[PDB]
Structure formats: structure tokens, C-alpha cells
Amino acid sequence: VSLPEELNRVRLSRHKLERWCHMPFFAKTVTGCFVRIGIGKPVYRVAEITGVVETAKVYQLGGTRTNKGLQLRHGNDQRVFRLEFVSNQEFTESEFMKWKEAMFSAGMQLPTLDEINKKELSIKEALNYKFNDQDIEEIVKEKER
Amino acid sequence: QQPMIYICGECHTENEIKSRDPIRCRECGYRIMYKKRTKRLVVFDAR
């Protein structure tokens, strides 16, 4: 991977998380993609979706509300994150090279492009997924909470 | 790429139902739910 354009295919925007706030297998589709999280003034850093955490702060994102967190990390600086500070902006050049330098600076291997190509299709298969099992039920239980 | 959107009864929230789905609302749980108006041209004669 040497290009911020291929990196945007697995870039998770803000309009896609709202559909999967209650879809399970969540720790298996989003873990391996990159989000454009906010720090703040218009600077951004490419953080790594590491684990699925939950905050005790329930915040509303438009119509929907979600109190969960995201285990993100920019190379070595890792902390908790909420689902509102993510940007719909794609991976720019300065932020792509900044993430490249944070990964070369941390000792983390850059994930091979074939991994991104095998990871970007997980999203499209998760979108066209027929919800024939008992996911509607847990979804309503999770929405009413 | 249109998913056939319905409106719940008791919720009034648009749901997406594709075929082979249970008709239930994505929230609160409701088995009755209605369809949205058409997109075709409705023209009347004020008559």
C-alpha cells in the first residue's frame, strides 16, 4: 500500500456506522479498516480500528443514538473514541503520509494491499446480508434500551 | 437500488424491507405497516 486512494475503500465514513450500530459480527467486519477520526484544528490522523468498546456516555448521532466506543490508535497513541468525531472526509495525502510515518515510527507493519482488497469486500457482503435469523429481535431489544 | 421502504404503524419510522423478510419494525416491534406514496405524477383537475 502506497496510496491514499486504495486506503479510502476501507475508509469507514459516518453514514455507514449508523446502519450497523446493532448488527452483530461487528468485531469481525470493522476490525481492520481505517476511519478518519477527529482530533482538532482541521488536522486529522488515521487511527486503527482495534477493538469494540462501549462508553457509559450515550450520545445521539442525528436521529440514532449510540453509547459505544472504538478502540482506535495512531501508531502508538491509543485511547477511547466515540462514533461522532469520525469524518466523512476521505484519506488525504498529508494524513496518509502522516499515518505512514506514525506506522514506520511505531514498528507496525503496513498491512499489505491484498489484505485491504480482501477486507473491502467484507463490507459489501455485510451490506447485502439477508437478515433471516434472530437479529431483528436483538436489534429491537438494543434499540429500545 | 431501491429497497421497498415501509412505514410502521405505531412507530412512523421508515423501514427497509426486501423480500424474504419478516415484516416487523426496526424498532418497537410492530407487525402492521404501510407503504409510502407513489413517485408518479399525480395531477388533478380542481373540478
Binding site: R14, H15, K16, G38, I39, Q89 | -
Partner: peptide
Amino acid sequence: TSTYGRYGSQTPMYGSG
């Protein structure tokens, strides 16, 4: 109907709170 942002809806920052 996949990502209709058209930018966005004023993305809130982390260092703003």
C-alpha cells in the same frame, strides 16, 4: 443510497469537548 453526505453534517472534533 450508500453514503449521501454532500462536507457532511458538521463533524464534531475530539479536542473540542
